[PDB]
């Protein structure tokens, strides 16, 4: 109901990210059907933390911001959804800092968000899963799990 | 007509009243191709389960009819079924943030039976195992039904 403040931080956020963003990472505002920018819907990418079985994979997620931003965190959704205990089958990511009623702050910047999500991949919160598959494999056969992750990283490696 | 009043307020009595054809009715007045649908009919009927020979027979037969047909329909996706099921039983959180059923003794008594049946796709066992065996989940104690289920599941 009041996106004037939103499109404003999304603009300085768009700047801050350009002056210095993490390697291999991608975060850019989509283009409206007319041709003008849209700081509301963003297309990003996170490359697997080197050394982890996510290494070499490029994981694309969408960042949708409400008219509430920064009062509220954005909704980060992996496109396509990923095999991971804290990622819903819809693609949505379940991270503590992306919940307004939790560790979210308007201070939190995009770079901080994509990085938090990068970390969440190797170190999942299995205490509270958002998906059954990743969870089941993780608890029952932790090795098969890692194998699944590596195959998923490869599948998302730049071709 | 009358089956609709049973689904609005499940009851072991209302169930018996539907008559000898609850098996056929449930299977008919239910879209057995929509996972969310079947889950609702499952949980509801399952909340009416009880040890009384009269009722117990009725509830497990209805479920057998419902799930047998459901797991058979190619279009029906068992994984969504399970997933949504775990959701409604409050074992697996969700995005819609759906309000979980009140009690879990009924579904757990029925799940043991269901899982022992042929119509049940065995590749679902471990997923169910993981959440029924999740030590910190909604399941907070030494349940009786929980033990049989679990035993059956590892045995699979």
UniProtKB/Swiss-Prot annotation, chain A:
Effect seen on changing residue 86 to Q: Impairs catalytic activity
Listed CDD domains: UBCc_UBE2I (cd23798)
UniProt keyword terms in alphabetical order: Acetylation, ATP-binding, Cell cycle, Cell division, Chromosome partition, Cytoplasm, Host-virus interaction, Isopeptide bond, Mitosis, Nucleotide-binding, Nucleus, Phosphoprotein, Transferase, Ubl conjugation, Ubl conjugation pathway
Site (Interaction with RANBP2): 5, 26, 58
Chain residue numbers at which the record places covalent cross-link Glycyl lysine isopeptide (Lys-Gly) (interchain with G-Cter in SUMO1): 50
Keyword Cell division (UniProt): yes
Record-listed N-acetylserine modification sites: 3
GO molecular function annotations of the record: ATP binding; enzyme binding; HLH domain binding; RING-like zinc finger domain binding; RNA binding; small protein activating enzyme binding; SUMO conjugating enzyme activity; SUMO transferase activity
Positions of the catalytic residues: 94 (glycyl thioester intermediate)
Effect after changing residue 128 to S: No effect on catalytic activity
EC number: 2.3.2.-
Modified residues (Phosphoserine): 72
Highest taxon in the source lineage: Eukaryota
Pfam families from the UniProt entry: UQ_con
An individual GO BP term: positive regulation of canonical NF-kappaB signal transduction
Domain UBC core stretches: 5-158
InterPro entries to which the protein is assigned, alphabetical: Ub_conjugating_enzyme, UBQ-conjugat_E2_core, UBQ-conjugating_AS, UBQ-conjugating_enzyme/RWD
Covalent link location (Glycyl lysine isopeptide (Lys-Gly) (interchain with G-Cter in SUMO2)): 19, 49-50, 102
Subcellular location: Nucleus; Cytoplasm; Cytoplasm, Perinuclear region
Post-translational modification: Phosphorylation at Ser-72 significantly enhances SUMOylation activity.
Any one cellular-component term (Gene Ontology): nucleus
Location of cross-link Glycyl lysine isopeptide (Lys-Gly) (interchain with G-Cter in ubiquitin): 19
Principal localisation: nucleus
Protein family per UniProt: Belongs to the ubiquitin-conjugating enzyme family.
Identification of the protein by name: SUMO-conjugating enzyme UBC9
UniProt gene name: UBE2I
UniProtKB/Swiss-Prot annotation, chain B:
Chain positions of motif SUMO conjugation: 92-95
Effect of gene knockout: Embryonic development is arrested around 6 dpc.
Ubl conjugation among keywords: yes
Record keywords, A-Z: Acetylation, Centromere, Chromosome, Cytoplasm, Cytoskeleton, GTPase activation, Isopeptide bond, Kinetochore, Leucine-rich repeat, Nucleus, Phosphoprotein, Repeat, Ubl conjugation
GO cellular component: aggresome; axon cytoplasm; cytoplasm; cytoplasmic periphery of the nuclear pore complex; cytosol; dendrite; kinetochore; mitotic spindle
UniProt GO BP: cellular response to vasopressin; negative regulation of protein export from nucleus; nuclear export; protein sumoylation; response to axon injury; signal transduction
Variant or mutagenesis effect after changing residue 131 to A: No UBE2I binding nor sumoylation. Not targeted to nuclear pore complexes
Listed result of changing residue 83 to A: No effect on UBE2I binding nor on sumoylation
Position(s), cross-link Glycyl lysine isopeptide (Lys-Gly) (interchain with G-Cter in SUMO): 93
Modification type Phosphoserine: residues: 4, 8, 11
Residue(s) of cross-link: Glycyl lysine isopeptide (Lys-Gly) (interchain with G-Cter in SUMO2): 21, 93
Effect of residue 95 to A: No UBE2I binding nor sumoylation
A GO term, aspect molecular function: GTPase activator activity
N6-acetyllysine modification, residue list: 93
Tissue specificity note: Detected in adult brain, liver, kidney, intestine, uterus and ovary.
Region named Important for accumulation in the nucleus: 108-133
Subcellular location per the Swiss-Prot or TrEMBL entry: Cytoplasm; Nucleus, Nucleoplasm; Nucleus envelope; Chromosome, Centromere, Kinetochore
Location of Phosphothreonine modifications: 5
Coiled coil feature spans: none
Similarity comment text for this entry: Belongs to the RNA1 family.
Function: GTPase activator for RAN. Converts cytoplasmic GTP-bound RAN to GDP-bound RAN, which is essential for RAN-mediated nuclear import and export. Mediates dissociation of cargo from nuclear export complexes containing XPO1, RAN and RANBP2 after nuclear export. Required for postimplantation embryonic development.
Complexes and interactors: Homodimer. Interacts with RAN. Forms a complex with RANBP2/NUP358, NXF1 and NXT1. Forms a tight complex in association with RANBP2 and UBE2I/UBC9, the ubiquitin-conjugating enzyme E2. Interacts with UBE2I; the interaction conjugates SUMO1 to RANGAP1, and subsequently stabilizes interactions of sumoylated RANGAP1 with RANBP2. The complex composed of RANBP2, SUMO1, RANGAP1 and UBE2I associates with nuclear pore complexes. Identified in a complex composed of RAN, RANBP2, sumoylated RANGAP1, UBE2I and XPO1. Interacts with TRAF6. Interacts with SUMO1 and SENP1.
Official protein name in the record: Ran GTPase-activating protein 1
Lineage of source species: Eukaryota, Metazoa, Chordata, Craniata, Vertebrata
